[PDB]
Structure formats: structure tokens, C-alpha cells
Symmetry: C7
Subunit: 173 residues, 7 copies
Amino acid sequence: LIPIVVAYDIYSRLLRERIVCVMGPIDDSVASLVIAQLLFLQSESNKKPIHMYINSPGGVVTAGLAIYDTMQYILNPICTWCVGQAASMGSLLLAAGTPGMRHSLPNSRIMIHQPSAIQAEEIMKLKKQLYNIYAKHTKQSLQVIESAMERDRYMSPMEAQEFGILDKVLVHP
Amino acid sequence: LIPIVVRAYDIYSRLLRERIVCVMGPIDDSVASLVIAQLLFLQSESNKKPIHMYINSPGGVVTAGLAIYDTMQYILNPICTWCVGQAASMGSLLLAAGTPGMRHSLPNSRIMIHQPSAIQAEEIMKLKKQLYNIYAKHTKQSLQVIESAMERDRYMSPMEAQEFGILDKVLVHP
Amino acid sequence: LIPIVYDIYSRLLRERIVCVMGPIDDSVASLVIAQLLFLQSESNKKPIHMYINSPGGVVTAGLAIYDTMQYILNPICTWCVGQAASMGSLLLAAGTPGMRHSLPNSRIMIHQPSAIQAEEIMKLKKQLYNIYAKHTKQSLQVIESAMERDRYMSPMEAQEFGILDKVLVH
Amino acid sequence: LIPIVVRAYDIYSRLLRERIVCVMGPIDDSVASLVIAQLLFLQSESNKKPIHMYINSPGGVVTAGLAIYDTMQYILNPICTWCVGQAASMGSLLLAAGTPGMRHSLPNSRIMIHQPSAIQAEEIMKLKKQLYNIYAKHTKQSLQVIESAMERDRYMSPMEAQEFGILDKVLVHPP
Amino acid sequence: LIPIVAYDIYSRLLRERIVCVMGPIDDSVASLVIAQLLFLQSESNKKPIHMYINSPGGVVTAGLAIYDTMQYILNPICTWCVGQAASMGSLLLAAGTPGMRHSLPNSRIMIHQPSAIQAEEIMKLKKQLYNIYAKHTKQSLQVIESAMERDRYMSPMEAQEFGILDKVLVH
Amino acid sequence: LIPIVRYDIYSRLLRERIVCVMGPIDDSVASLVIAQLLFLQSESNKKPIHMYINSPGGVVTAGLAIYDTMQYILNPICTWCVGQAASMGSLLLAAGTPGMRHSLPNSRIMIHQPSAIQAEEIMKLKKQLYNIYAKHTKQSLQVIESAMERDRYMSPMEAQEFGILDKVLVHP
Amino acid sequence: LIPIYDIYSRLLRERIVCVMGPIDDSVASLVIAQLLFLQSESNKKPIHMYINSPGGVVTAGLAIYDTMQYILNPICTWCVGQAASMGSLLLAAGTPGMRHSLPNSRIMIHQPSAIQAEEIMKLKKQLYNIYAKHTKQSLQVIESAMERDRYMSPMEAQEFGILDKVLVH
């Protein structure tokens, strides 16, 4: 499947360039890999930026929160890039990049809404944490976040930049 | 198994050494990540030499194709897009997104820009207005023509697609 | 597993042999097209050998392979092994004039046995008639008539029809 | 698809060179076997350098988790334990079984001591009583307090789990 | 698992010019057998090739692909029946070189074809099998037609008397 | 999934003369364990071998194949119960060398055989288990036959008192 | 999964062939390849076959058996765990004096139960001839002993002539 480049597979040469890809649904296996790649890239140097490319519909909240906390834990600056879409938990990882270093390509779709075995109280505690993350990183008030997360829709990149999910939309070809 | 040739490469990696990217079968998030990774790698090898992009796909996920498209536009290199077999829905967008003068088809290919067949209607319509806009910029056609052409569930020949502006050259010769 | 000597198929590819075996689809077509384009770069003038044992498959996948055969400048030997049916017999007939061969016991079928609109299936079908007409030099009516009969023909009858040039009598 | 790092290692073997053991996903006999083998290997390389265990798990088989726990207590090394994402049921026992002073959580980890639900009833209760004694040893709560806390089907926050005695530090950033 | 001896055991046998035709025959098996036959001819057109047959038969047009390769190449082919060669497996056995077709004492031979395309097309293929067996067995088509409809296995001694085999190993 | 460490983690352990019997026992497991046991005897007939048991048991005739190899080879075998040794897993524990059978504190031992061939053939095979346990535990057949009837696990400190193992490695 | 040569390629270098699990045409193919290879390495050094098998396809087992009898090497056969049905024929087909079992092995010569009944019967009559030849029992004993659906101990299997040695170790 994966081509070889000169030998490496392409994803491991991207990792050698300090690029981490989060593609497709987030789960405890995807999180485990992303966590391991972030902890590794910190051990190789704690000063060079890391580049995280997001194309995901989101996924499990607990897996997404594990990736988030590690991005906040590691000392590296993190550039974060949206390609195609970043929805639900995927847009939290996008929002959680370093201020000034959060980017999107012009046609990406951003969704802050959190699409609909556990007690009701425990899902609500997770959501209350999400409101505080979005308020922290977007600098919106909690009242704005709660109503924004109620609308089941995708933002355009220009709407998401004025909302504060993005810093830059790179239209330059 | 993929045959090894001649260092020893599988042919898909040898073709990548010739700066050829293969987009084969349906487009999904896995294909999109592979195509974007291949494209970003080829830019690092040089910013100037063209990239060759061989399209044989029935299309696929719209947001996956837009991720490939956005990467094609970000990269500075000329991209030569070759239609082989067919390019339907999102596949004909990728064909059309090659650099002007470098979009080619073999003569028995079928081109379809109609989008055949989990999301709210408002977001599919927003996605579809993007397709109308980006076809118009790449084909140099009016939105009314695009809207009309994307409504007919039909394929068009490469000679028709050249007149419509999806293609630049049809290689009827060897 | 397949035996090592290279893998057995990579050893054959170094002899400029392309094995089309089994049903043809987009995954098979992409393999065959990749191999055909490579072998032209390795030398622009030495023949390529295509060995065909196929029941056919997707039409656009087969037409993708066929277009590559006509694009590259090399002669192509086509060898019918066991059977070449539907799109498999088009690839057999697409070999270079004088260089289309069959083993004595091969069965060839040009009929097309048995997501798309009816008008689009018929337009594809009319393309096949034009391909067979130019390569067999039969009239369009004979092609339409012979492709309607759900049958196989022997190599000696396929040679008389113009699908083949040589049958390799034992 | 697991990236390779350049000798060439997969990402998990590269981390094992940092003395990092990833206990991720559910625990079963093959997970237990793999963790125990890694712990015994890492002890051979140094009996006094710390080991780092990263935990994100919903729990698993109890006897498989107790096998891992017993290995953590056998080896002489300090074990720093990290909760990322969640540590539930048996995953919280491996968290609590880290070295005193070296059990850490990130701020959004979910901690559940409760045990959600093939053998006779007497064997489940006998496993339970072992768990109560292990938690009492490490959290320094009394058995009845553990029994009352372990009956509520809920998750603690990291700060609440520190007050319960499952954790020593909650870290936003490295100090 | 296949043992390693460096080669896996089947590639080590191929260096002895041994081709194992074992298990059911299909279009994928035919590809492997034909590629191995053409390779062994490239390494030498003179030295014999050894075919080891253990199969219940299979697809007719796949077995005919193997058969036509056996007759095309110039090498002598020793065919060995191991365990059984039924239906199309017994055609490859009979198509060995005259005097070089061998069997072990407990091999079971069956020329009958046990048990989509039109009826008329199966019958044309079937009539080809009669001609192939008649050529190699040195027997009347009427005898082949009668023998090929009996749903039975021959012993190696019966198969030698019929003309499918030349030699039976005695132990 | 298995990390590498010139090995994978398990071939590195095998170089320390450690054999792992993990998960259920079947014909595949029996063949692998017997091969490893015969290999380690060739490397030396004098150094101990370490066998780590975490098993729910499995096919009885597969476990007896492992057992007979343990008794054939000349090496001392240390047997370690980690987590659980039930049914056939407890026979491999009992069949370690005397003075060299160990358990971790939280292990579960079960001698009972949790519930094809004819009924008479299972009882024939069952009667061999009574003889094997009686040899190694030094209990009488009546004590073995009575103990095997209770569908229960037991703690290391009771299997030590029963004679299934010799040492419990209390945590420091 | 398989420890590291791999453990079986190392064992094959000691001239050990493992027959474990049920026998089918793919197992027969791999065992026959190993037997023919080991004869090429030398036609004089013994070969060791380890059997732990329920048996399986009869014609696959008969293909192995004829290969064991064709090659000139001595073959030492070891019953490990169980040898049932066709597994007991491979065991019995070891070299006289070199057919061994561990003490707790179970041996069964009964043949538990795509082709016609008359054809299965022709196969079973060959089985009677093989067992009578190798065990030196009469055909009437073999025919009766295959009818009883039972296992026997290695000591009882030695009295029947399927074994020569029991390794009290």
C-alpha cells in the first residue's frame, strides 16, 4: 500500500520532518499512536516546532482529550493544519494548536458541534470540559460556546477564523 | 503481489520516483492522506519539475477530494493530469484542476462531472455551490452552464470534454 | 506464497512479460498500466509480451489497459493461455498485427456476458464495435452479430475470424 | 500503520529505549504477557533507573491486571505512572500501584475506581476482597471507605482522585 | 509456516526442477505452474522437469492451460502422482512424457470429471478431453467415453493397464 | 505490535532460558512449547529453565504433551504462576522441579477441570490426572479426587499448604 | 509468534519433522517436501518424525506414508500427546525398533466418521493391509480392532505392535 521513498515509507519520512498526521476517526489506537509520536518528537528536540495535519470527523472524546492534553504538556510549539474537514473532537485539536500557528486550506469544513453504556452525568461532565477548552482557546465566553455548539453545521474557514478556531486561511497557491 | 523491479522498488514507488502520482479507485480519507503525502514529498524533491497525476477513479468522498484539490492548488509545481479509464464526480474535478495546457485524456476515457447519489441538506448544498464555483474558475464557463451540466446524469466523450473545457489535449495518436 | 528464484513474477517482468490473469478490474488495470509504462522506459523498441488468461471484467478498466497498449510504441505480443473472454479477447486482439498467438486449446469469447444509465452502457458497447472492426477488419454488422452469440470459438475459428495470427501447434 | 524511526525501530520499540511502557487499550492475557515481558526486560537493563508507564485503558480481565500489578511490585525499579485520557477499573489499580510520589495525571483524565460488569459467584467476591486490600494499601483509606467509594458507578476528576489518594500530582506542564 | 533451509522449502525444490501441483487447480494455480514451467525451460531446455501431482482436479480451462505448457516446452516432464490425481489432476498425470509417468502404490486415479456457461460450451470442452486422453492413452475414443462416465477411482495397477501410467514404484 | 529489542521481546526472553505458557493451551501451543523445551536442552542440560504460566488451561492431551516433555528433559525447571493457573495450567505448575515451583501473591490456582470423544475415554484420561497430581503433590488419590471435585480457585498460600507449589514470593 | 532461524527451521536442521495438528493435503505437501529434502542431505542419517495429530484426510496420509516407505533413511516416529486415525498409521510406519511414545500419549487406530461408499471401502481395505503388514497382526485382528471406538495406552499399544519403546523418562 504505502509507497517507499529514498528507504522509508512516506508517513515515516513525514514523521522525520516532524509532521504528524491525524487522518480519519480518532480512537484509542489513533490516540496511542499520536501520543507516542508527540512524546517521541519531544525527546528528539524540545525546541523545534511540530506540524500536526488534521483531517478527521472527530471521534471518541476520551481519546481526543488525551491527544489535547499531551499537545498542551509538550514544550514544543505546535503548528496545526486542517485539510478537508475537522469536525467535533477534530476541531478541538485544531483549536488547541499554538496561538498564531493554526492554519486551514480554503475549502476545509470546520464543525464545532459535537454530533450525538455511560451514565448521563458523566457525558455532561465531559461536555463541561469541552466548553472550557473552547472558551480558553477561542477566547469566547462560555455562553457563546454553548449556543454555538448547539447548531449542527459546518463553518467555512473565514467564519471559523472570525470565531477564533483559525489564525490564518492560506489562499495563496 | 506488486512486482519488484531492478536498489529494488515496487513499481508504484518507482513511478513516484518519476514524479507520477496514481489516483486509482474510490477516493476516501486513506487515499486522500496518501495523495497529499505523495504530493508534499514531490514538492520537496523540487519546486520546478512537473508532477504527473494519473486519474482512474469513480470519485468518492467530497471532503476527501477537496483535500486533494486544495493540496494541488497550494503546490507551486505544474501538475499534468491524465484521465485514463474514467473520471467521474470528484475524479473529474481533480482532472480539471491540472495546470492550464497540461490536462490530458486517452481517447476512450469517459468524463463525468455530475455527482451521483449522513449530512444535512444545507451542508451538501454548501459543498455543491463550491463545486459550481470551482468548476467555473477551472473551465472558464458560466455557473448556469455548470449547474445545467452537473444536473444531467451522463458521461461525455473526451472530445466533448475538451470543448467543454475539462481537457486540453486528447491523445488519439500513439 | 509464490516461489523465489526475485519473486517468480518479478523475474518474468524482467523478461518483459506481463501476466494478465484472472478477472480485470481497476486494481488489475493499474498494475498492468504501471508495468506497461515502465517497460517502455526500459527500452523504447524491444517487444513486450502479454500473457492473457482472463474472463474479462470492468469495461473501463479493460479500455484503460487497451489505450496504453496503443499509446506505447513497442510491439506487443499477445498470448491466449487457457481462455480470453469478453474484455480479455479485446486485449488479445489488440496485440501487434502478426504477433497475436494462441495455444491450441484456448477458448476465445468476444460476447459480453450478462450504477450506470442504459444510454451509457450502449455508448460503451458501440466503442467496442469500433475497436473490433479496426483490428479484425470485419464489418460492424458481423461484429454486432458475432458478439450477440453467447458462445466460445476455437483458436482455428478465431484465427479465421481475425482475432489471431498464429496457433502454436504442438 | 505504525511509523518507523531510524538502526530502524517502530515507534513503540523506540519508546521502549526510553524505558516507556504503553499500557493502552483494554487489558487481557496477551496485553498482560506483553507488559510483563517489557517490565522484566527493562529491569535487566537497569535495576535502579525509573520506568515510565503511560496508561489509557478502560480496564480488562482482573487476573490479567493483577498479573501486571504483581510484576510492578516485584521489580526493584521506581515506576512513574501517567494517566492520559482515562484509567478505569483495573486501569486505576495500575495507576495507584505506581511508586509513591510518582503517580501523575493530566488535567482532563477520567478516573474510575468502580468495576463495571463465567465463574462462580464465590470467585468474583474473592477477587473483590483482594482489590479492596490492594487499594487500601496504596490509597491508605480504610476498607469500608474503599467499599463505599467502589460501589458508586462514577468517574472522579484528577483533583478528586488526588484527595482520594490515587494520585500524587496533577500536571499541566513539566515543572 | 514454511521451513527455511537460504530458501523456503518450495523454492529449494524448484532449484531441483521440481514443480508441486498440489491442491485444487484454478486460474491462480495455473499462473504459478506456467510461470515455473517457462522459467525451468529458460534455465535449460534439455534437463527433465519433475511434476508432483496431488490434486482433486479443478477448473477445466486452468488445467488445459497447464497441459498446453507441458506440450509446448521441449523438456521431458516426469509426472508423479502423490496421494491422488482425480479429474483434471489425472490429465496432467497422463500428459507426462511417455515412459516417465510414475505413481506410488497407494495413489488413487480418477479420469471421471465429478459433477457458469451454456451446456453446449461444456460439451465442446468435454470433447476436447476425450481427444486429449485418447492421444496420450493410445486408446479408442469409445473406450475413453465409457471409462470417463464411471464415477470411480482406479488403483495404480489398473491405471497402468489403462495407459495413464508407465511405472509403479514397488517399495 | 510486539516490540523489538542484533530480537522480538519473546526471543530475547527465550535467550534467558524463559519459556512462556500464556493463554489457552492447544495443539499449536503444545507444539511451540515442546520445540522450545527441546531446544533449551540442547543449549545445556544443566542450567535451569524458567516456565511462566498464565493460562486458563485447554486441551487435556495438549497439556499432557507439554508435561511429558518437562519430565523427559534433564534440566531443572522453575515454574512461575503469574496471574492465573487453572485446570491444565495447574498441572504444569505442579510438574516443576521440587523446590523450584513459585507463585506471585495474587495468583489463582484451580485443580478442577471445567466441563468430542466417548464418555469412557474422558474418564480414562481423567484417571491419569489423579495419578500425576498424586505423584507431584504427594497427596493420596482420595485427597486429589476429593479436591478436584470442588469447582473453586484457591490462593497461593493454600496451594502451598496443599503442596501444589513451594514458594510464594511475598512483595517487598 | 514463533520464537527465533525460526524454531522449526532450526529443528529441521536436526532432521526433525513435526507432524502436529490435523492432516490435510497442504500438510502432506509440506511434510513430503521436508522428507525428500532430508533424504537429499544424506540417505544414511536417521530422520525423526514427531506426531501429535488427530489424523485427517486419508489420501493425504497415504501420500505421506508412501513417502516414508520410499525414502531409504531410518525414520524414528514419536507419539506426542495423541496419535489418532491416520496419525496412528504414520506412527506405526516408523522403522522397526524405532517407534517411540511418551508415557501419557493416547493411541487410536479406529478411523472416525465427497465420494461414494464403495470408494471409501476400497480405501479402508488398503488400511487393513498396511496395519497388518506393519503391526504383524492378522487381518482379522486389524479388522476387528478398527471397529472398537476406543483409545489405548502406550503399554497396550506396544502389545499390539504399534510401538517398540516407551520412554519411561
